[PDB]
Design a protein around this ligand. Sequence first.
Ligand code: CA
Ligand code: CA
Ligand code: CA
Length: 281
Amino acid sequence: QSNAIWGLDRIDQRNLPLDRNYNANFDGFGVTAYVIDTGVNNNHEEFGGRSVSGYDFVDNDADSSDCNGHGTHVAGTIGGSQYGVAKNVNIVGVRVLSCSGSGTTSGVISGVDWVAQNASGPSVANMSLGGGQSTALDSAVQGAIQSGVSFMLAAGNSNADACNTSPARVPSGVTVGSTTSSDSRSSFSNWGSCVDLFAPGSQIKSAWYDGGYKTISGTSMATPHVAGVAALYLQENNGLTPLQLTGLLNSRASENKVSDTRGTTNKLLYSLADSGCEPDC
Ligand SMILES: [Ca+2]
Ligand SMILES: [Ca+2]
Ligand SMILES: [Ca+2]
């Protein structure tokens, strides 16, 4: 609410300066976010029971507990009570990355397919992960999106063209670059024609796998801001197809706020239900 951390603070307003407030009209009630990552600590206090295990494709078991931190931190930015965007969203852990944060292409695909097969009501998927170009992984993500589930994808952190990263480059995904609280593109953020918009990703505080908290930076942290907002939009309109949700993320985004976009469309995440063309529509 107040004393809001900067990422949340930024996404409910058009312009700087920050006002230390995160205002919301929705909270993700009745929506489920599938976190395809290192797992999620279901017992973390930030979730208040709204997190449950999905499946663990690293160890082939039913317990998607997190032994790295990244997955929990991402889930916290989507749905944590203090530090999340959509404070009553449901969270499901889809563990495809090991305690060290490594995974296999085929294990990630299994997680993607699992979300397509198991999503029930209004759903969004978060993939804060990426590696080399893979047509097989691209095809699985494209398939899950055709199934009706929107996918938020990290652009990557190499200060490079996101189009050379899978799954970031999948056109029908919503691919997210990272900014700081000064509205600069984060210096590590990938960039380019495959990036759909920017969101807060530098110095983001959220839940950690040990039950405490951690502040970290990456396009991996920007992405769940966007998934969080997708959950807000899905609560507002349960029936949005991925094409409709993409359209709305675009039309509602704040325009021309970001510096050093380096060939990326100048759109920054906005969490509220009104259109960002409003200078000149
Ligand atoms: Ca604010
Ligand atoms: Ca496990
Ligand atoms: Ca896209």
